Design a binder for this molecule. Structure first.
Ligand SMILES: NC(=O)c1ccc[n+]([C@@H]2O[C@H](COP(=O)([O-])OP(=O)(O)OC[C@H]3O[C@@H](n4cnc5c(N)ncnc54)[C@H](OP(=O)(O)O)[C@@H]3O)[C@@H](O)[C@H]2O)c1
Ligand SMILES: NC(=O)c1ccc[n+]([C@@H]2O[C@H](COP(=O)([O-])OP(=O)(O)OC[C@H]3O[C@@H](n4cnc5c(N)ncnc54)[C@H](OP(=O)(O)O)[C@@H]3O)[C@@H](O)[C@H]2O)c1
Ligand SMILES: CC(C)(Oc1ccc(F)cc1Cl)C(=O)N[C@@H]1[C@@H]2C[C@@H]3C[C@H]1C[C@@](S(C)(=O)=O)(C3)C2
Ligand SMILES: CC(C)(Oc1ccc(F)cc1Cl)C(=O)N[C@@H]1[C@@H]2C[C@@H]3C[C@H]1C[C@@](S(C)(=O)=O)(C3)C2
Ligand code: NI
Ligand code: NI
Ligand code: NI
Ligand code: NI
Lengths: 275, 275
């Protein structure tokens, strides 16, 4: 109905973010029982999206779903399961899309539990890292793609500074996050040439103040953590705007130094050869 | 005995490559039945190294082993098996080190069979890519590390331009090669702080004229391929000199553009904070 005539607007030749870009949109959020995943569920609810949230803990997901509905979600549902289970991953998306009658955005956020430790002999954690953090994202993507091709939708992949540069104590985790870049940046190029109108947003996040991260770094690293609330909002904005990469960190020097113009230029040369 | 007094030498304040750096050294080469792996076996034989070569095809490995001995290898052995089998991977190294009485260099070269195709639905190839191309390298590394800690030896990891930048048609392969960078660059940092004197050399190679690559790219990509013989030699030189990364490509613009000074600087800042 009413407007707010005192609220400022900017002048342009073009485009910004508005919540209406998510109003009535059909969105899956994975790892949504806590942290950034949960915050993203909430933001999307407030924007009047349809949300399907997932994670292992059904009891906490019930709470998220309940709060989503309170905040103004168009609809809110959960399906419980582990992303170690590739059959679940595949069935979760089909079930999520039937609930909503479609899919506009796939937000891939979950990771297997990880701590800061030097590597020796924990091959299982390495495999489990690759399966949960990387392989399930590929399985979810494959299941989701027919629906996303219909809606010209978006895949949002949550990664890390440790998915662009190296760090000790997180080798397995870092390997999986690098793998995400390798894989999705490659299919992004494939979609460009096969005219698949599905955007891919890789999100490169510095340290975020979730309980899990703050516990993991206690006494080992002494650094600023960015607020989980806005981090979650920035992820959604990047995906909604169909941006290839999103950067979010407490430090602006860091966000400066994770860009790779050489790689952009090398890839630009390969595709100008193709063009 | 004799010298060659007409052969030139350079002036310095320090260091170059000499074959003697491999004389009597104990070296594992994986994927050594053909291509770059086989060429590396040969180079090492000529330098009078002890070699243990592996791959699935025992009949071709017998030939490699035979030619290695002819070229002047200190000793030459093969152990056949698939790197899909993590128990084999682990047992191969123990068996290889017993054969040689130690280990100076682990050369990780093998990949699972891959072709140029757009990605859809081949989740098995993606998993198999991660297991063979990435996971087995971690298992081999873990098995090998006690021996390498003894000899202050070296791990040489064969990667690709598709392990530093993105390319269509090789998403699964690219994901695994990115994973290698993530993982080994991280443990390199860990070894630095835990005073583990084992070098890690990540090799970033452009297109090489092996039969397998040349078949894979026929009619799809029209580019120069560098000779497999020298590529193999450059890999060995980089590892012997304990260099963190090696670049080899037909094009010098390409080798210019795969360096990432931003990443070096970001990591340099993290370790100056630690220092
Ligand atoms: N926080 C940071 O400082 C930081 C920095 C860089 C990147 N990131 C990235 O941001 C994302 C979220 O981070 P966060 O700190 O908010 O993590 P978090 O709070 O620990 O949440 C992880 C979520 O994934 C779910 N999950 C864990 N294992 C699962 C499994 N096997 N199958 C299905 N779901 C599983 C968890 O729910 P259940 O346990 O109930 O299953 C939880 O909801 C991750 O991708 C992370 O790598 C975070
Ligand atoms: N050639 C290029 O243009 C190029 C470019 C960039 C990077 N590279 C990298 O260079 C390395 C070698 O390349 P290449 O072209 O010389 O490859 P290649 O000729 O096809 O050799 C691959 C080797 O790995 C072995 N292998 C395959 N599957 C295996 C398995 N499951 N278990 C154990 N061994 C297995 C093969 O022997 P069996 O079949 O008998 O097992 C073979 O000896 C690879 O790491 C590749 O990614 C190559
Ligand atoms: C930005 C990074 C690189 O922060 C660091 C980590 C380690 C360092 F050495 C330095 C830094 Cl800056 C990062 O991604 N950290 C996360 C964080 C803390 C740990 C490790 C990583 C996974 C989690 S998780 C998902 O909750 O399992 C656990 C959450
Ligand atoms: C340098 C790269 C990126 O060359 C390209 C590949 C695809 C492109 F689109 C462009 C370019 Cl430049 C590269 O690594 N190619 C190899 C080569 C050819 C194919 C794919 C890759 C694995 C093999 S293999 C190991 O023998 O399975 C098969 C051998
Ligand atoms: Ni109002
Ligand atoms: Ni404004
Ligand atoms: Ni002579
Ligand atoms: Ni000279």
């Amino acid at each position: 109905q009413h407007q707010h005539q005192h609220q400022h607007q900017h002048q342009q030749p073009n485009e910004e973010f508005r919540p209406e870009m998510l109003q009535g949109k059909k969105v899956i959020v994975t790892g949504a029982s806590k942290g950034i995943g949960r915050e993203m569920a909430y933001h999307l609810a407030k924007m009047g999206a349809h949300v399907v949230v997932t994670a292992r803990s059904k009891e906490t997901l019930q709470k998220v779903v309940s709060h989503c509905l309170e905040l103004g979600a168009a609809s809110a549902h959960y399906i419980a399961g582990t992303m170690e289970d590739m059959t679940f991953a595949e069935q979760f998306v089909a079930q999520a899309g039937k609930l909503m009658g479609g899919l506009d955005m796939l937000i891939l956020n979950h990771i297997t539990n990880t701590s800061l430790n030097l590597f020796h002999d924990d091959i299982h954690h390495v495999r489990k890292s690759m399966e949960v953090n990387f392989l399930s994202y590929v399985v979810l993507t494959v299941a989701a793609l027919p629906m996303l091709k219909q809606s010209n939708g978006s895949i949002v992949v949550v990664s890390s500074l440790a998915g662009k540069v190296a760090y000790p104590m997180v080798a397995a985790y870092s390997a999986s996050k690098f793998a995400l870049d390798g894989f999705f940046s490659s299919i992004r190029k494939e979609y460009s040439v096969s005219r698949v109108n599905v955007s891919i947003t890789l999100c490169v996040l510095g340290l975020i103040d979730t309980e899990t991260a703050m516990k993991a770094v206690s006494g080992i690293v002494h650094m600023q953590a960015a607020p989980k609330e806005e981090c979650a909002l920035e992820i959604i904005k990047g995906g909604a705007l169909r941006q290839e990469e999103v950067y979010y960190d407490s430090s602006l020097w860091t966000t400066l130094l994770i860009r790779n113009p050489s790689r952009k230029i090398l890839e630009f040369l390969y595709s100008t050869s193709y063009n």
